[PDB]
Design a protein around this ligand. Structure first.
Ligand SMILES: CC[C@H](C)[C@H]1O[C@]2(CC[C@@H]1C)C[C@@H]1C[C@@H](C/C=C(\C)[C@@H](O[C@H]3C[C@H](OC)[C@@H](O[C@H]4C[C@H](OC)[C@@H](O)[C@H](C)O4)[C@H](C)O3)[C@@H](C)/C=C/C=C3\CO[C@@H]4[C@H](O)C(C)=C[C@@H](C(=O)O1)[C@]34O)O2
Ligand SMILES: *[C@@H]1O[C@H](CO)[C@@H](O)[C@H](O)[C@H]1NC(C)=O
Ligand SMILES: *[C@@H]1O[C@H](CO)[C@@H](O)[C@H](O)[C@H]1NC(C)=O
Ligand SMILES: N[C@@H](CCC(=O)O)C(=O)O
Ligand SMILES: N[C@@H](CCC(=O)O)C(=O)O
Lengths: 210, 261, 214, 174, 192, 195, 87, 87
């Protein structure tokens, strides 16, 4: 039905001015959508920012502000701070219920950009004894913590059987992720070449195996 | 869609004068919810009080079912104007005055659920009689009630039952519009009675009013003690100056009268 | 300061039904209406419904009509949520978020709860089957597969090799959780230097090690 | 819109000679509806500071049958609330200091209903209470003092003063 | 304590009509409405109708519409019930049961009366027709018809007359059957 | 028309918890049936227990309680007493009148149980002569006082004896020509039959 | 009777009032109620306080004939008060 | 049944403006019952009082008979809206 759309992720430095947007699929975001903005800090910490008519939650910093720029809802942080780095969900009110967006992972740069370290492991002959094939693809040492994992089996991109974890802060403030591939014992022998590709900050890192 | 669903219901042979049918021929069961909005003008002389409330009635009328199981159609349909529906001819036995609110548009709400269930909501302002007992006047508690029953339909045709969950509700801004009293307790009961024309089902909601004391403390007790105490300061005047004593005793006495009046 | 403390995590079998709470403190409980939000691993945030404490009145998302039942206990300042006919799809984290306005609906969110993780699985207590992951710089890893319930603990060289190790989030691939864990070492230390990974599943007292051979 | 006034206790449309309404149908389908209404609204008052108090009275406006999915009220963007020029001059006892325009949408047992709320702030005029309460009471208390200047032997004069002013004080309060 | 004392037992011929009373005491009589229940040997308990003392208002069971007539005498705190065109079927015990609520219908029962046994019959005295019955310890029987181990069982009502038997277990056995109202005593020898 | 149904009889020991039920023939017992419960002690002593909405008669012990378990009315005695042994009639309100049930004879145990001593007597020659044959199936010595005779028939009402074991008599009426057989008594378990 | 605090409905009657008018003879019924005024109020608010007022005028018969200001103050006050009460 | 009985009564030529007929041409006899609910505001100055009551009138209108002896039909039928009756 109605779908809310947000930027997958955004970047900004401490002090700058960033703007997140919330798009309605049925049309323009009007005042009767009561655009809401919610923040999610790590460890599942949710709190409201803006919403209703032009109301805001208790304690919401003055730098946060809402508007209807263009035909979608906006959330403008004027003078971004280090602690402002979180995931921002916006929700539109359609008639009688709320619909949330995909969320935007805002990153406040307190570290140099680091390209991801992709490794693709071949399904151990050990587990092939169980007539089951599992390709692991470990992704480490990258920043910001937002990567797009796409699989490929002999050129054609994987559509089924793939599962990728959400990036997680590691020791050195960089993020990490892992992506699995599920195949029958039969499939590994049947298909010779696989590759897990990872997109980060634009560029892509490919690791394959025959 | 909705206008079409309404068309299909009244295109057939529907009579709003006929009581809805029943599986076992039993009476129509009318579930009642009541939302008190304001309780005001608590007249002690004429022993009555005013109260505005939203009456909510719900009964089943299989003749109005359109979706049955539905699951493909709208859960319910708002009944538009020009469509007649049998409604419980309910009245308030102890009402002395009553007003429906019809400003710009009548203040009613009718819904016809797919299964034939009907919701009826309406704003009503009442002036009900409430016999009061002033034995303890200054520090008394009164119990006032709103009775609700059918007028023409007997026990075989219509039966009232209080909604199972929270039959009586109060609006948040009720106690703040009731400065002189404190609504301590409410109850939801039945008052079905047997009359000369038959046995009529009846509901009774009851509110308990506790009279605020601060006023009577300041306007009666305090000033009377202060008045009695003044009559004592004449015990300290020499017995020779009796004009002073009389002036005190007499004045306080006269004043006491006035205050009582 | 206001707070919304929800019940602890729960594990229940499909077909069953359980009820999570949300005890409110630090404000006039009966003044602000409560929302219930569902965050699942498979989808986004979903709005289940809302209830007015003072009113008892409720309004549900069509999607959860029948799946959820919002109630409220004024005396204890607690908001409850029943979930019926639980299935695999109901495995999620359920938050309760307060509305903003005082004794009126404002349609904006104030405070949320820490969340309540509900896990619905008819799975039996199963130990982890560990498989070795082998390929200047060399990277080695383990694969803790088909285990339940969580959690698990992983180490390297019985704890010796603790630098550069990464234990990734778990996943639900076949109704059983599964995670992996890598490590970085100079090549001159492998296969040269002998090394192994240590898995420890407390739910069935399973502590299996698996050597990482080429 | 089947709009009503939730806190209205009495209401009247003005229909003398002809109903006092105005309906316009713009080409684009936009409809203007104007109507004169006299209301008697409930306004809970707080007299903690009685003589020098300020009260806030409101007019609520919402749909009765239509829920949030069918009808939604929004205050006009520019000057939602307006006052006629001859309003403060027909309000002698108070002074309309401030007005506000808000929303009061609420969730009920029959659904969620959109609601607007205009609020006026009434400041009680002091001149009356100065002249009819404070002045005459000081004047009364001061009279009770002029008995401190009568010889202690003529106590009938002192009592007559103190008692009279005291009694009078009571009456005034009543 | 409240009490509902009804009139004594009555014997009347078919076609006639009699009226049983129910004097109430121990409560404000005009406050609680009265029910009338009929307990017959042939059927269960039947609800005849009810009357509001304060109101005079009545409501009857369709079944007894015309058979019963409920009235009330406020002065004497008594509730009456007329029964018309009495027949064999009207032979029963009639109870009066008070409703529960004070000056309103509550639809629940408080106190009943001891009951009033009404017998409607049109048969004159009749000599008991004794018929002997017979098959360690052997049990013998003696049947009275149309009127150690000494077991005389209850008396039925066969064709407008009574009929009971008489067991008697023992390791010349005869049974004495007397009847005061008819002045006839008969003996029946129990032979194998 | 509408028929109310109850358990013919029930048994329970002092202190236990027994439940009587009241079934409606038209459907489920709803609140507008105002299920009533009435007790009848020996010698025709009637008194109300429960009824109306959820009202009870003055003095009705706290152990008595009403409910709508399943789709029929219930009467639960929590902690039965010796004096609780009586006949319980329940009445449902259908539209504008009351309908009573068959009643339930609740027995609070006091004496060890006893099988019914049955004996089937054939019609004597004096009856067959009158052209009317009568069968008598006498039942002696049994407890509790609840038997069910199964062979125009007419069984009497259970009545205690000198040893506190209720007794009764059954009468199967025929004609002399019809005459030209067996009585079985089912008593709380086994079934004693004779031909 | 419980909603009628000030009076007591002692008796009722049911009569006819058929009258002959200029347009004809019209049948008419007349129900009549008899209202007895409750006395407790007038006892406490009129009689008692007046006796109490008259009795006070007597306590001046016990003051020495020399102190007439006391006597006048009593007699005059009670008299004035009597007026007010009557009004 | 009931709606049918009402149909049969007004399907014929019935006029609610015409006084019900009589056997001997006599007048219509209207029996009156009266139920006083409340008697209040007994004004002594304006010499008047307020009273709420239930008026009950009963007359015979042979034109509205449908069952006559009945004994097979409902004793009476509640008059629904839209049906005019001389009162
Ligand atoms: C007693 C009268 C003389 C004049 C005395 O008056 C004063 C002082 C001087 C005199 C000695 C002043 C007077 C009070 C009396 C004292 C009275 C009481 C303390 C109480 O009453 C007594 C007597 C009363 O029975 C007369 C008796 O009730 C009985 C008998 C009655 O039937 C004969 C019957 O109806 C009743 C049911 O059961 C009662 C139990 O107990 C008290 C109840 C009185 C209150 C009086 C008043 C309250 O507000 C009234 C009015 O607003 C006002 C301005 C003056 C008051 C007053 O008049 O004040 C006032 O009328 O003394
Ligand atoms: C009026 O103005 C003051 C200051 O803006 C504000 O505090 C007050 O709430 C206002 N009153 C209303 C009723 O709008
Ligand atoms: C009421 O009762 C009195 C008793 O004496 C009697 O005189 C009068 O006629 C009766 N009727 C009325 C008018 O109430
Ligand atoms: N419910 C009404 C019915 C009308 C009547 O009885 O006359 C009453 O009892 O007053
Ligand atoms: N808007 C109306 C709707 C009526 C109802 O809820 O029954 C209200 O104040 O509640």
């Amino acid at each position: 039905q109605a779908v809310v759309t947000q930027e997958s992720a955004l970047t900004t430095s401490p002090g700058e001015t960033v703007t997140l947007t919330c798009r309605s699929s049925t049309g323009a975001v009007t005042t009767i959508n009561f655009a809401n903005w919610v923040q999610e800090k790590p460890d599942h910490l949710f709190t409201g920012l803006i919403g209703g008519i032009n109301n805001r939650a208790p304690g919401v910093p003055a730098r946060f502000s809402g508007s209807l720029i263009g035909d979608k809802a906006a959330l403008t942080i004027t003078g971004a701070q280090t602690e402002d780095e979180a995931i921002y969900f916006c929700a539109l009110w359609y008639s009688n219920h709320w619909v949330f967006g995909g969320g935007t992972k805002l990153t406040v740069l307190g570290q140099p950009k680091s390209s991801p370290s992709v490794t693709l492991f071949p399904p151990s002959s050990e587990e092939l004894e169980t007539n089951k094939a599992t390709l692991v693809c470990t992704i480490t040492d990258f920043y910001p913590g937002v990567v797009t994992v796409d699989w490929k089996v002999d050129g054609t991109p994987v559509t089924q059987g793939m599962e990728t974890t959400q990036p997680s802060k590691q020791s050195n403030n960089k993020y990490m992720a892992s992506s699995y591939l599920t195949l029958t014992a039969r499939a590994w022998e049947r298909h010779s070449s696989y590759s897990c590709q990872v997109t980060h900050e634009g560029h892509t890192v490919e690791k394959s195996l025959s | 869609s909705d206008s079409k669903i309404l068309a299909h219901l009244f295109t057939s042979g529907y009579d709003f004068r006929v009581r809805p049918p029943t599986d076992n021929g039993g009476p129509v069961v009318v579930s009642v919810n009541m939302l008190l909005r304001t309780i005001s003008k608590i007249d002690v002389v004429n022993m009555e009080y005013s109260a505005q409330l939203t009456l909510r009635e719900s009964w089943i009328d299989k003749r109005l079912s359109y979706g049955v199981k539905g699951d493909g159609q709208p859960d319910f349909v708002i009944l538009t104007v020009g469509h007649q529906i049998w409604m419980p001819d309910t009245f308030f036995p102890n009402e002395k005055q009553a007003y429906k609110h019809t400003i710009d548009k009548p203040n009613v709400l009718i819904r016809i659920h797919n299964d034939g269930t009907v919701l009826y909501s309406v704003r009503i302002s009442l002036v009900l009689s409430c016999p009061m007992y002033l034995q303890y006047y200054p520090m008394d508690v009164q119990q006032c009630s709103i009775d609700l029953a059918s007028y023409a339909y007997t026990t075989k045709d219509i039966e009232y039952l209080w909604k199972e969950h929270s039959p009586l509700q109060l609006k948040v801004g009720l106690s703040s519009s009731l400065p002189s009293f404190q609504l301590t307790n409410t109850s939801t009961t039945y008052c079905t009675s047997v009359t000369n024309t038959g046995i009529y089902s009846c509901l009774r909601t009851t509110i308990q009013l506790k009279r605020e004391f601060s006023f009577y403390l300041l306007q009666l007790y305090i000033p009377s003690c202060m008045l009695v105490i003044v009559s004592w300061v004449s015990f300290w005047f020499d017995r020779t100056a009796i004009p002073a004593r009389v002036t005190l005793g007499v004045t306080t006495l006269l004043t006491m009268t006035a205050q009582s009046a | 300061e206001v707070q919304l403390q929800q019940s602890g995590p729960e594990l229940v079998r499909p077909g069953a039904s359980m009820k999570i709470s949300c005890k409110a403190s630090g404000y006039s409980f009966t003044g602000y209406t409560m929302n219930w939000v569902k965050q699942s691993h498979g989808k986004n945030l979903e709005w289940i419904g809302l209830i007015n404490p003072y009113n008892g009145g409720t309004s549900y998302n069509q999607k959860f009509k029948g799946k959820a039942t919002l109630t409220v206990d004024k005396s204890s300042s607690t908001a409850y949520m029943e979930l019926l006919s639980l299935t695999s799809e109901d495995s999620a984290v359920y938050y309760c978020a307060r509305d903003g306005d005082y004794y009126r609906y404002g349609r904006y969110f104030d405070y949320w709860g820490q969340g309540t993780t509900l896990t619905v699985s008819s799975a039996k207590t199963t130990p982890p089957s560990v498989y070795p992951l082998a390929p200047s710089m060399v990277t080695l890893g383990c694969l803790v597969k088909g285990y339940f319930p969580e959690p698990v603990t992983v180490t390297w060289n019985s704890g010796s090799l603790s630098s550069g190790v990464h234990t990734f989030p778990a996943v639900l691939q076949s109704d059983l959780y599964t995670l992996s864990s890598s490590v970085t070492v100079p090549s001159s230390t492998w296969p040269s230097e002998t090394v192994t990974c240590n898995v420890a599943h407390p739910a069935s007292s399973t502590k299996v090690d698996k050597k990482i051979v080429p």
